Design a binder for this molecule. Structure first.
Ligand SMILES: Nc1ncnc2c1ncn2[C@@H]1O[C@H](COP(=O)(O)OP(=O)(O)O)[C@@H](O)[C@H]1O
Lengths: 131, 373, 45, 130
């Protein structure tokens, strides 16, 4: 009742406000970081959530950072082709002993905010960059 | 680049074939084998023993016509070898020894059938790789959505499968043996009522053409019967190949109505809408809401004008009110079982799926159960 | 081997047409003549 | 019947075009091959569908490809002699292990594109120049 209404107020205000504030600032920081590496292949992204759905930006970012060419993307504009390209990128990430969890192809394709942010965070933190 | 595989769809009525990655099949022809009936008095003519494909359909009067596939099961295998030889060497002019082959199968059928196809294609045609896929999975591939329920209906078999996020439910797969050939035979039996007589195998093709041209599914059956009995505005005229003119009339919508009431054929099974609802109801509680909005039709038998509205109305009548029903009927659905196959052979990971020649040589013809779903 | 006239015709029969496709032209899947609808992300971008 | 119209529409266009282009380029290649192989004798084929109808061209092609003698073609302008001439070449193909389906002499005589193209393709693939 009223106590439940107060609990709903507390959670909806504080938890959601703090989570969204931190997530917005980290999204801006991650976008600014990834654009610098993506500029060398003359590719630029505007929104981090939507432009990683297709999967070509992710495979080109891994192309920049690794220095080794990846298998070519599948020629398609469907859902299953996006799943193929994201699976290729995640297989390459598994190949370099980087540990990822709760991260399937459909999570990146459907555009989950937390999992995309976690993938970018793991790329920033654990991955080895050579020049 | 690697060699494009051959996508070959073996339907009960028609056989389709083409190259992977194309948007359309390159050869479509009926799966009929005919043999001569009368005696030949002209010396020096052709001495061919078996007509196959469109050539058998070209000369129907002097031939007895047979189907190597009935109810999704191959009954004669020499005729199947003739069908595949005419498909490969004549309709496509390709060499089968350098092309992987994808094949298409109904969900539930005799098991040994699979082995026989494998045992043929590695032995007589010497293909380097081959694969077998279910019809409705390929139809869902060609639909473009991962989650949905697929209802397929051809000339041999009707089947419904549910798939949620790429995961199939084997216990909810439903199969029904009411299909297009049963509708053709029922149309023959109901056209007997007007005095028209059709008995031979050549006349069954005529009846099939009449059914394809002049049949539609009525939205309401009793109202349509009252309308057709009250007035003669529903009649249509057809011209026989020998110049006779016949009038169908009330038989236009009674033949497709047998898809929803199987008691017309004496079968005690349920209609296609009841089969779809029962296949939905066998699934888990959570995934039903996505399945109600993603119903997909497929196969040639679902090309009757007005089938989608009737199916949506009946399923909405069965389903609870708070859920919404969407029937997805693409305009090119007759080739969907082919088209998704042409998608499936073009994927990157499907190169890891093929049953190689070496694997068959190592483990015999029973390997197809370990690899193919 | 020991016949070089017609094996090139055999090699020409592998492609969907009897001639190899132009490298400049795009594939059948991306040419926007494909009958199946595309994904939501691609059409949105 | 807009969906049925669109199905007939797709059937009328894409399957027919995709078959027609393959058929055109295949017959253009086959004409070059048969002209190169028939140039040793004083013969030339200007149309694949019409020159192989009569049957002398086919029996001469089997003569030069096999390198080995064939029976006298019957002489006559009517259809029956043409059927005979096609049938003798078909029998000669039947001897040397080549397997044919849906092949009748009246199919070549009437001029079916699919069957004559398949016959030429089978000649290229399975027969031996030797
Ligand atoms: N335009 C149409 N309207 C109504 N029914 C049709 C139409 N075209 C085909 N059919 C029915 O569909 C059948 C062909 O289905 P098909 O797709 O060949 O089945 P499969 O290929 O799975 O064997 C025919 O027997 C015919 O009864």
């Amino acid at each position: 009742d009223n106590d439940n209404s107060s609990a709903r107020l507390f959670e909806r205000s504080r938890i959601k406000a703090l989570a969204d504030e931190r997530e917005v600032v980290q999204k801006k920081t991650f976008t600014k970081w990834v654009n610098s590496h993506l500029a060398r292949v003359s590719c630029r992204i505007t929104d981090l959530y939507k432009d990683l759905r297709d999967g070509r930006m992710l495979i080109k970012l891994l192309e920049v950072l690794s220095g080794e060419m990846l298998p070519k993307p599948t020629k398609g504009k469907m859902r299953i082709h996006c799943l193929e390209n994201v699976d290729k990128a995640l297989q390459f990430l598994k190949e370099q002993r980087v540990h990822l969890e709760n991260m399937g192809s459909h999570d990146i394709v459907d555009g989950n905010h937390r999992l995309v942010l976690g993938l970018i965070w793991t790329i920033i933190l654990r991955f080895q960059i050579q020049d | 680049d690697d060699i494009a595989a051959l996508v070959v769809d073996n339907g009960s009525g028609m056989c389709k074939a083409g190259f992977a990655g194309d948007d359309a099949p390159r050869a479509v022809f009926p799966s009929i084998v005919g043999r001569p009936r009368h005696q030949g008095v002209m010396v020096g003519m052709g001495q061919k023993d078996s007509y196959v494909g469109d050539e058998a359909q070209s000369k129907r009067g002097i031939l007895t016509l047979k189907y190597p596939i009935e109810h999704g099961i191959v009954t004669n295998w020499d005729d199947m070898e003739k069908i595949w030889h005419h498909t490969f060497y004549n309709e496509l002019r390709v060499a089968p020894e350098e092309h992987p082959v994808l094949l298409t199968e109904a969900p539930l059928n005799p098991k040994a059938n699979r082995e026989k196809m494998t045992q043929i294609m590695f032995e007589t045609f010497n293909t380097p790789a081959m694969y077998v896929a279910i019809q409705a999975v390929l139809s869902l591939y060609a639909s473009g959505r991962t989650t949905g329920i697929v209802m397929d209906s051809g000339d041999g078999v009707t089947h419904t499968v549910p798939i949620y996020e790429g995961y199939a439910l084997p216990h909810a797969i439903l199969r029904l043996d009411l299909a297009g050939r049963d509708l053709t035979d029922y149309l023959m039996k109901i056209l007997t009522e007007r005095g028209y007589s059709f008995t031979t195998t050549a006349e069954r093709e005529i009846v099939r053409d009449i059914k394809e041209k002049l049949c539609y599914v009525a939205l309401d059956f009793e109202q349509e019967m009252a309308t057709a009995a009250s007035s003669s505005s529903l009649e249509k005229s057809y011209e026989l190949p020998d110049g006779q003119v016949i009038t169908i009339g009330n038989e236009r919508f009674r033949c497709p109505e047998a898809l929803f009431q199987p008691s017309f054929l004496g079968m005690e099974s349920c209609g296609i809408h009841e089969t779809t609802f029962n296949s939905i109801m066998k699934c888990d509680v959570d995934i039903r809401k996505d399945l109600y909005a993603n119903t997909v039709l497929s196969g040639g038998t679902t090309m009757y004008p007005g089938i989608a509205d009737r199916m949506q109305k009946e399923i909405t009548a069965l389903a609870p009110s708070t859920m919404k029903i969407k029937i997805i009927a693409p305009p090119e659905r007759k080739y969907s079982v082919w088209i998704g196959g042409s998608i499936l052979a073009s994927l990157s990971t499907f190169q890891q799926m093929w049953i190689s020649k070496q694997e068959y040589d190592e483990s015999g013809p029973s390997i197809v159960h370990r690899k193919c779903f | 081997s020991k016949h070089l006239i017609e094996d090139l015709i055999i090699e020409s029969s592998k492609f969907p047409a009897a001639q190899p496709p132009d490298p400049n032209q795009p594939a059948k899947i991306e040419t926007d003549y494909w009958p199946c609808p595309p994904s939501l992300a691609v059409v949105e971008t």
